[PDB]
């Protein structure tokens, strides 16, 4: 819901104006300060030109208080399955030597496996000595050889990425609305900056965080929900540990790329002269993914995923106290004086007084032309801005008050002449 809650006036030192084409346009070459609104509130910025009717506003709609993460060391993992080939050769045949079979390298293709083909997977070359003689099927009394060519492949149609968090960055998804009416949805965390059409914006004050995040590892799933594991980050991949086979990208797991990190001497073998059943006792991450699936209840917070942008968040139940820095990179703000008439009417007034959420107000704006409405009180601390077009619409926003019996006179206009207006409504006490 729209509505200006924290409003401040820009300084005249960084506010210069000019005149071009019977219009008074003004640009900003500085940075102002405004309090960050809570859930539903906004942080408008009043922009005065040369008189009173030429007044602009920059609405910043705050979604909710969130806590993002900071990924540092990440890796991809998934399920795999061995696929080895067997080929027995008698002694004094090709390169059948027990001295060479004992110290056989993995990155050396043997003469009996050079006809496999294009295998850009995690392949290895092993060797094991067997029996010989006439009882096993050879001419020489010396034992025979058994060259082993084992290469891994991908059998699971999906993969998982395991990462961690070093500092819960308090991210605030802001919906900054430009002066003309352009709506832009961005996000600001701790002291991060973005890039908007009017310049740049960055979060200032930040007094909200969760300690003890290094001893927690998260799992990301493409499309489905995320996960949470109650253990520190995985160190070196060894045998009998969660994350013994890691890669770097998703295609390296879905297609088993050779540029991955696996545990050495992990693929088992069963030397049976002729047969050889090779199996791997890999760790299945889907069990942990099903036992610890988000959302979960951890202490007094709510850990869940995030919509739209991929990433893990952390829902909090505290207050929203922050500051915003509106950096203007010398952007002109034009305003054309309208001349359409309007006849607004008061509807209701429900909400709260002296609250961070504000009180909801609604009006019955009835105009005959497309334009905008600019209103103000008497002392100079409240302003009402609502779109107007040809027809009869009911625009609503949020206004803050410090009294349950609101009896403030408003001065709204749509072309120049201002007319009085009285509002009233009963509010409740909300902390």
């Amino acid at each position: 819901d729209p509505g200006c809650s924290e409003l401040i006036q820009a300084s005249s030192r960084i506010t210069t104006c000019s005149t071009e084409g019977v219009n008074t346009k003004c640009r900003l070459s500085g940075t102002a300060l405004i309090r960050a609104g809570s859930v539903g509130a906004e942080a408008c910025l009043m922009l005065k030109g040369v008189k009173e009717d030429q007044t602009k506003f920059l609405k910043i709609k705050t979604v909710s208080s969130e806590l993002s993460c900071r990924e540092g060391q990440s890796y991809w993992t998934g399920s795999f399955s061995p696929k080895c080939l067997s080929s027995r050769r008698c002694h004094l045949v090709g390169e059948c030597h027990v001295n060479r079979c004992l110290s056989w390298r993995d990155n050396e293709t043997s003469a009996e496996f050079s006809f496999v083909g294009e295998s850009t997977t995690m392949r290895e070359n092993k060797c094991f000595e067997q029996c010989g003689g006439w009882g096993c099927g050879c001419f020489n009394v010396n034992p025979s050889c058994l060259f082993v060519h084992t290469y891994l492949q991908s059998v699971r149609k999906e993969a998982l990425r395991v990462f961690n968090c070093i500092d819960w960055v308090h991210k605030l998804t802001l919906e900054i609305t430009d002066f003309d009416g352009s709506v832009s949805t961005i996000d600001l965390g701790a002291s991060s900056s973005r890039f908007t059409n009017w310049g740049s914006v960055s979060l200032s004050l930040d007094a909200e965080g969760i300690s003890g995040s290094n001893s927690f590892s998260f799992i990301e799933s493409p499309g489905k929900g995320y996960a949470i594991v109650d253990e520190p980050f995985s160190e070196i991949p060894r045998q009998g540990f969660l994350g013994e086979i890691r890669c770097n990208s998703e295609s390296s797991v879905l297609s088993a790329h050779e540029s991955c990190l696996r545990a050495p001497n992990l693929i088992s073998y069963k030397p049976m002269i002729d047969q050889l059943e090779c199996t791997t006792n890999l760790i299945d991450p889907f069990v942990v993914f099903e036992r610890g699936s988000l959302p979960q209840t951890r202490n007094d917070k709510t850990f869940a995923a995030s919509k739209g942008n991929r990433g893990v968040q952390a829902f909090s139940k505290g207050s929203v106290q922050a500051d915003l820095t509106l950096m203007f990179d010398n952007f002109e703000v034009d305003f054309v004086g309208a001349a359409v008439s309007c006849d607004a009417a008061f509807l209701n007034l429900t909400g709260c007084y002296s609250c961070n959420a504000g009180a909801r107000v609604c009006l019955s704006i009835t105009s005959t032309g497309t334009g905008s409405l600019s209103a103000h009180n008497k002392d100079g601390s409240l302003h009402i801005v609502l779109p107007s077009e040809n027809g009869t619409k009911d625009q609503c926003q949020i206004l803050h008050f410090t009294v349950p019996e609101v009896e403030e006179e408003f001065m709204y206009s749509c072309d120049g002449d201002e007319r009085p207006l009285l509002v009233k409504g009963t509010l409740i006490a909300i902390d």
């Binding site: 080939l85 080929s87 004094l92 090709g94 003469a111 006809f115 099927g137 001419f139 149609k157």
Partner: protein
């Protein structure tokens, strides 16, 4: 190098109808007479499986030995497009000819001989598929598959494709699929049993028993053409036989050698004899096993 691998046992015939007018030198395959349908199989760095098993029979030799039948038609006519018997079995296959060729043979799904043909004067492209317009004109067939054939009598015509998890591989449609598939040219082997079809292989686990069988050696006529000589006629050690035989230390260490007084010269071959394979957990003796680069459509989403 020494062209000792040109001595093919049995008949050693490499000729097909339609084209290939070099049958005067390719029948049989000996030292004299350049045969373009066999010289490309001896160059290193191309087909290592046939070089490791260069002591058995080829595809055409298996056709001329009452092993592999002939398809109808045996040579596809590439003149009429928009439909021909050589379309699905070749478009998915990924090969590479060294140009200046017109004919190329491969294996069909039935288990016979299916080959293409370019009428004169055309030429094969860089992928050995369709023909093209125009050095020398080599009318011989180019081996599109790295396969080897032998003789066997083990029955096994009740087995289909053993691959599990692939929708459509090559030309056989195991199951229907309409979602996203991992279309990629992979090197998947294949095997043909006794009067069977194109049985695809998920893994290759061979088995060769090096014994005193004639198929485990390449005995030929002693010099100082050449066909296959039965080793059973060679006398045993410390005994007496019919004819005379000789060889190296591997042959003289088991039988009797007479050096120049022998009508045949034997030698120990590398990778020859009874060749078995694993299928359904049971050892069987196939006929023609080779590799091919066909389009494999694995499951995904």
């Amino acid at each position: 190098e020494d062209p000792h691998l040109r001595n093919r046992p049995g008949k050693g015939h490499n000729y097909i109808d339609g084209m290939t007018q070099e049958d005067a030198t390719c029948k049989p395959v000996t030292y004299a007479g350049a045969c373009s349908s066999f010289d490309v199989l001896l160059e290193k760095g191309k087909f290592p499986l046939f070089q490791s098993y260069a002591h058995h029979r080829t595809l055409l030799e298996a056709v001329h030995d009452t092993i592999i039948a002939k398809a109808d038609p045996p040579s596809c006519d590439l003149q009429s497009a928009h439909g021909n018997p050589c379309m699905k079995e070749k478009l998915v296959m990924k090969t590479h000819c060294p140009n200046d060729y017109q004919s190329a043979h491969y294996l069909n799904n039935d288990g016979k001989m299916a080959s293409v043909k370019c009428p004169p004067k055309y030429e094969l492209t860089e992928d050995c598929n369709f023909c093209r317009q125009m050095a020398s004109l080599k009318k011989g067939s180019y081996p599109l598959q790295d396969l080897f054939c032998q003789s066997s009598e083990d029955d096994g015509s009740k087995l289909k494709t053993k691959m599990k998890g692939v929708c459509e591989v090559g030309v056989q449609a195991l199951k229907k699929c309409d979602g996203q598939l991992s279309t990629a040219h992979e090197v998947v082997p294949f095997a043909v049993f006794k009067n069977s079809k194109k049985v695809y292989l998920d893994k290759l686990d061979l088995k060769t028993e090096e014994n005193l069988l004639p198929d485990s050696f390449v005995c030929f006529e002693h010099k100082g053409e050449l066909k296959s000589f039965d080793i059973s006629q060679c006398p045993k050690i410390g005994g007496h036989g019919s004819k005379k035989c000789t060889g190296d230390a591997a042959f003289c260490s088991a039988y009797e050698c007479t050096a120049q007084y022998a009508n045949a010269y034997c030698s120990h071959a590398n990778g020859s004899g009874i060749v078995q394979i694993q299928v359904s957990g049971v050892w069987k003796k196939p006929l023609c096993v080779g590799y091919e680069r066909v389009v494999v459509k694995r499951e995904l989403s």
